Design a binder for this molecule. Structure first.
Ligand SMILES: CC(=O)N[C@H]1[C@H]([C@H](O)[C@H](O)CO)O[C@@](OC[C@H]2O[C@@H](O)[C@H](O)[C@@H](O)[C@H]2O)(C(=O)O)C[C@@H]1O
Ligand SMILES: CC(=O)N[C@H]1[C@H]([C@H](O)[C@H](O)CO)O[C@@](OC[C@H]2O[C@@H](O)[C@H](O)[C@@H](O)[C@H]2O)(C(=O)O)C[C@@H]1O
Ligand SMILES: CC(=O)N[C@H]1[C@H]([C@H](O)[C@H](O)CO)O[C@@](OC[C@H]2O[C@@H](O)[C@H](O)[C@@H](O)[C@H]2O)(C(=O)O)C[C@@H]1O
Ligand code: NAG
Ligand code: NAG
Ligand code: NAG
Ligand code: NAG
Ligand code: NAG
Ligand code: NAG
Ligand code: NAG
Ligand code: NAG
Ligand code: NAG
Lengths: 321, 162, 321, 162, 162, 321
């Protein structure tokens, strides 16, 4: 008669690593790394992302006429932009402090577009011939829909003096621009006055832009340039414009209604018709694992990202052969 | 393993012991069979479960990458940004892999130790009333019916009675 | 007869955590995390901090007339500034490269104010009517005490050409400024000359500022702006001014006598009448613990900061019930 | 614990043993009492003391946050700065908590081991001149007066003499 | 050490045992000598070798500093850059020192454990056919010639035969 | 008769540290930290570094006449620059976005110099009297060899209008500059025209520089300043210059033939006549150790840098005395 002490064994082929030994077969183990995603861009907790498709943040915000899809976008959860969107600045140029603005958007979930300087109200200037072949719409020359490219009327560009008071409650994103022409002849041809400027002032802003003549390679058929600028007008504050020519005046500015957690995600993927609690640029994640290895840039309630191929914890004991 | 029991003096495990991590096997004239030691098993389950939750929880706070964009003449800070984000990933990847390796080793040894301690618990009861065979088993001097066997598993084995 | 082997027990209720078990009672333990502070701002090793009270670094350095307390400050150990000091730029504007200057101060323990261009010495210009209602002193209009706001004399602002040679041994912080007026009428009213400039040069500096007209919201009763600039004049180097108008000339500059470990600490707290070896924005620390959890931004000989609520090491053994 | 002694085959500690971490209790016709084993106690004190100083010292070099200010159009680098400073706090917070958990576990086991080893030291002297009761105690075959007891604690227990 | 064998009940090592980490020494009428236990030695060599390679490999991915230059009015980001690069060095320096301390401790205990387990392996064969002297040695009741000694090292010691 | 179980001992005095005990003698151990270097700068895998000696990257690239050694440099593995090279900007001034350019060089192994605007081709201007005593060559006044300092001819500086098309395949680094003179008299003396400018344009660049008059301390005998600028002209793109005076025109630009891993290493050391797989600013490294403590800034196939004085792993066991 005998009694023996012993331990469990089973048919398990799960393996774990230790410092001194790799691939130890164990009776029980627990994977803690999520390796799979659904390969799609999805709603984050039911709230759809802004998928800019072939438009950039600049195209969207300035109102590139190929970006009419985004003429009034509802609240978003995050934003998706391709690596090199084709519909950016249709008329070539720059967007001043562009990255700093994009950073500002990462804390914004909703814009509400409003008209601050009506197009009709420019009676002393021509406000309806501010178009170009670089920004086409349905076969015809058009322009950034949110700013108005003003030119001389009956051979006269009189001084502009406009002011807008932010009487609404929500911070206001105001965009405007300057036109840099090719030569002295083009300047007088559009604006008459040979030496011009745009002065912009707010509570804090103290700007004065002057156009800049230089001979430039053509880009989308134009050698002239537009340089766009922006500010955030606080509530009860007033923005003040004064110009001589070359002014791209605001028509519409964006009201900042909802501030919160957001992100600009860079991805080529389209909308997946889809819902998740954790999104990545490669696809959405649904798991209870404490870790994953899909992509570092996630949004939502996510496992922690690690660069591992494999994380498996021993729970049971060394399994016998 | 460090404690010499698992895959040591106890050569291999028991496919036949299904309801616990550690226990006993008996052989006498009435038959034979396996019985899980509930106490030491449950102790093991609590320990490993606390370990896993401790591990998950400690990794709770940990670096999260954010998108930041830079222009063509901001290459230095762009590169700083990249090295920063990558550096923290490398630090946390290392933490996670090393923790798993180290604790897996400790988990295997924990089990080994639990087995060695159950074996000793039985050894210290039986004293000189059984032969220590060298393989996990004790061969009794007296006959040990099922009630006898049960008292060994009880902690109750009445040594003076035999 | 018997001999037994055993271990210590006692009345301890100290507890420690392990990976596999929490709240294990032990016979002896050692707390290593400091959780308490005295709630005060104190001298650091006997050397008092500069408590700017309701003034900012700009107010202090430019000599905002509400900041006369700091007209000549002795050596400091660290500096304390509120989150939003009320006595900043009394006349509205900007301070150029302000943050880069504040960073410079973190390596400075002592300034010694000296006069470089006497107020009396401006004989061709009016140098005593450079005041405003935005910078009041004892009921009367005043101005930043360290720079001189020069205006036209007998309807004439002749060209200024001044030079100061840094013949003292210690690097010199020189501050100056430009005035941006509201309109063409205000320009000639103060400075006569309609198109003006300030040119500043040193061994390395090559500046030329031009005033900037724009219509601006009022801030502290003014729509005009001041923009302040600075440099560090090395020893044996000369600073050279030339202006037409709009020049806010230096009177006093600061000598950098002591360079060392310092910090600008952001806190609402006042002076505690107090001494410590380790200071935080919430209070001072006195302990031998290797760690604390009070605040990450400390100055002095400090424990290492961690975000833990509790760090306790087992020294003794598992205590029996 | 891993070594089976503390709160294992030795059920509980001794409120009555006041001058060391580990030692002996004796019972004979002359009386009874506790005696600390100085050597194994002092060994434990040196180990734990070195551990604590090692732990404190390793954390000596460690990240220190510095104040850096940024203007309204330097949000990207401000945010980089914040993520950097926070990230290092998270890394060092994790290091400190994990070290304390891991070493606390090791400290408890160290003690367990010191007890098991003192028990074995005594067991290996007494050999078959005493009954191993199973609870930390050895019951002698001969009478063992105070001088006898002292020789067990000495390391000097003359086995052939009994 | 935790397992009580090395510099414990086995007082010291053997300058005379040259071809392994652990083994046996025998004494009988035919002579005496040392013999390495190949199996437990090789096990130790595999473990320590895997440890070192694991340690080297885990440190493979690790922060690399890059040169970045800044002008006189970029002091804030220059300082950020410096604190970043230094901070990661401190984190990896700490990782490397702590790993080496911790694993060195584990390596010493691993050996201790391998010795304790070889001693027990022999003890469990000999059972009551030898006196356990208390110092690593077993003194036989029967004469044990070289073939006898070899069977103890074999794992083959025929207990019923003696 | 007896059999004993025991363990190895030997004559080793190697020691290791553990948490609980320091200086434990062990039978075997393995050092894993490389502490030695050869104290030299060496070829990296047979490919020599560019050792700028007493020249800076600016001196080199602008062609400071004391830096003729580097007039056509072959492919390099890394670059070595002293902390304060003496042959920098011989004519005083600044180099715009200098650090951003140096960063660009860290990804460049080879430049190929080519002529884009021949010196001879300036027939309407004087192109051979653009020299100064600040940039001497063999006793005589010279100038940055890669850019041409153009001055008036027969008292006439007519407008310059030049264009270069990047028809080669490799990105082109184009350098140019502006001259800032001392006073109105010097301006007309060199360039005739009192108010001048340089306009530069490419596909993306839209620059217009104006010279800046100010009274400046002398530096290397000059109070006038040069400010140098650069761009990367893509392939098929054109650069366009227009100026009135003060223009430092490109003669030579650098073709970017090889992009790859490189670094600018700061060191006082000269060439060692030497080859390594891992280089540091203090010397080269040859070891199989996984770690070293020489210097953090390395190039090549290197061990990982740690700040330790000592890393030694136990392999064997506690050695007996
Ligand atoms: C408001 C206005 O002036 N619109 C013009 C525009 C501007 O004058 C010009 O862009 C300023 O730089 O120019 C447009 O013509 C330029 C255009 O002419 C075509 O014939 C040619 O094919 C193109 O390459 C280009 O030169 C324009 O389309 O932008 C006309 C527009 O009405
Ligand atoms: C040196 C000087 O000119 N001081 C004037 C000052 C400047 O002319 C002006 O600030 C430049 O922009 O203007 C002061 O008057 C402006 C002031 O007038 C009050 O009547 C009114 O209540 C205020 O809102 C404001 O417009 C000034 O106080 O700043 C007078 C000062 O002497
Ligand atoms: C192209 C040209 O004009 N070269 C001049 C040069 C420039 O006019 C000047 O640098 C622009 O600021 O000036 C040179 O003379 C200046 C020089 O004169 C010496 O007599 C004196 O010793 C020096 O301190 C300095 O003032 C020059 O050498 O730079 C002559 C050069 O031909
Ligand atoms: C362990 O298993 C993996 C995956 O099955 C295999 O690729 C690997 O080579 C094994 N590793 C070792 C060290 O044997
Ligand atoms: C804007 O208008 C509101 C009331 O309509 C006023 O209170 C505010 O002060 C105005 N803006 C200014 C003063 O800049
Ligand atoms: C341990 O003790 C703390 C503080 O007394 C208590 O709040 C906590 O819930 C306990 N934790 C566990 C796991 O029992
Ligand atoms: C300033 O004066 C000193 C002597 O008074 C002189 O040596 C120095 O060169 C002067 N400053 C210059 C040249 O800029
Ligand atoms: C260990 O040895 C080193 C180097 O020989 C010596 O300097 C040091 O003081 C010793 N450390 C301790 C704790 O004894
Ligand atoms: C440069 O020339 C090439 C052909 O010689 C041409 O294709 C290219 O478009 C030119 N540059 C321009 C248009 O800027
Ligand atoms: C265990 O078993 C014995 C014998 O079967 C029985 O008499 C006794 O009551 C039991 N004791 C316990 C603690 O279960
Ligand atoms: C220990 O005790 C014995 C018996 O009391 C005594 O004779 C002997 O001298 C002592 N030996 C040591 C090493 O203390
Ligand atoms: C070991 O040794 C014994 C006695 O010398 C011998 O007869 C037997 O064949 C051997 N067995 C093994 C497994 O080596």
């Amino acid at each position: 008669d005998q009694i023996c002490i012993g331990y469990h064994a089973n048919n398990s082929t799960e393996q774990v690593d230790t410092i001194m030994e790799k691939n130890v077969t164990v009776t029980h183990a627990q994977d803690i790394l999520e390796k799979t995603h659904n390969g799609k861009l999805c709603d984050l907790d039911g709230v759809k992302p802004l998928i800019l498709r072939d438009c950039s943040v600049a195209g969207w915000l300035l109102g590139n006429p190929m970006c009419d899809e985004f003429i009034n976008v509802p609240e978003w959860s995050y934003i998706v932009e391709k690596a090199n969107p084709v519909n950016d600045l249709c008329y070539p140029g720059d967007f001043n402090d562009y990255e700093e603005l994009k950073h500002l958007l990462s804390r914004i979930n909703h814009f509400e577009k409003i008209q601050i300087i009506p197009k009709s109200s420019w009676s002393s200037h021509e406000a309806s011939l501010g178009v170009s072949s670089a920004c086409p719409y349905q076969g015809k020359s058009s322009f950034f829909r949110n700013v108005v490219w003003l030119i001389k009327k009956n051979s006269t560009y009189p001084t502009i003096k406009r002011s807008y008071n932010n009487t609404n409650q929500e911070d206001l994103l105001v965009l405007w621009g300057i036109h840099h022409p090719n030569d002295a002849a083009e300047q007088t041809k559009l604006y008459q006055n040979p030496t011009t400027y745009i002065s912009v002032g707010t509570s804090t802003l103290n700007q004065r832009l002057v156009p800049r003549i230089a001979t430039r390679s053509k880009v989308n058929g134009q050698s002239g340039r537009m340089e766009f600028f922006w500010t955030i007008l606080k509530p009860n504050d007033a923005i003040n414009f004064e110009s001589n020519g070359n002014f791209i005046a605001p028509e519409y500015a964006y009201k900042i209604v909802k501030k919160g957690d957001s992100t600009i995600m860079k991805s080529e993927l389209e909308y997946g018709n889809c819902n998740t609690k954790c999104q990545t640029p490669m696809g959405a994640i649904n798991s209870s694992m404490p870790f994953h290895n899909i992509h570092p840039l996630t949004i939502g309630e996510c496992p922690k990202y690690v660069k591992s191929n494999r994380l498996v914890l021993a729970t049971g004991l060394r399994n016998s052969p | 393993g460090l404690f010499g029991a698992i895959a040591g003096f106890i050569e291999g495990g028991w496919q036949g012991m299904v309801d616990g991590w550690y226990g006993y096997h008996h052989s006498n004239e009435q038959g034979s069979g396996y019985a899980a030691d509930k106490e030491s098993t449950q102790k093991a389950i609590d320990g490993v479960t606390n370990k896993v939750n401790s591990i998950i929880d400690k990794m709770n706070t940990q670096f999260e990458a954010v998108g930041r964009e830079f222009n063509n003449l901001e290459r230095r800070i762009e590169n700083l940004n990249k090295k920063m984000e990558d550096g923290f990933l490398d630090v946390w990847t290392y933490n996670a892999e090393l923790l798993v390796l180290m604790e897996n080793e400790r988990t295997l040894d924990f089990h080994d130790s639990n087995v060695k301690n159950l074996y000793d618990k039985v050894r210290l009861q039986l004293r000189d009333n059984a032969k220590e065979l060298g393989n996990g088993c004790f061969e009794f001097y007296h006959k040990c019916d099922n009630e006898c066997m049960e008292s060994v598993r009880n902690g109750t084995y009445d040594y003076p009675q035999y």
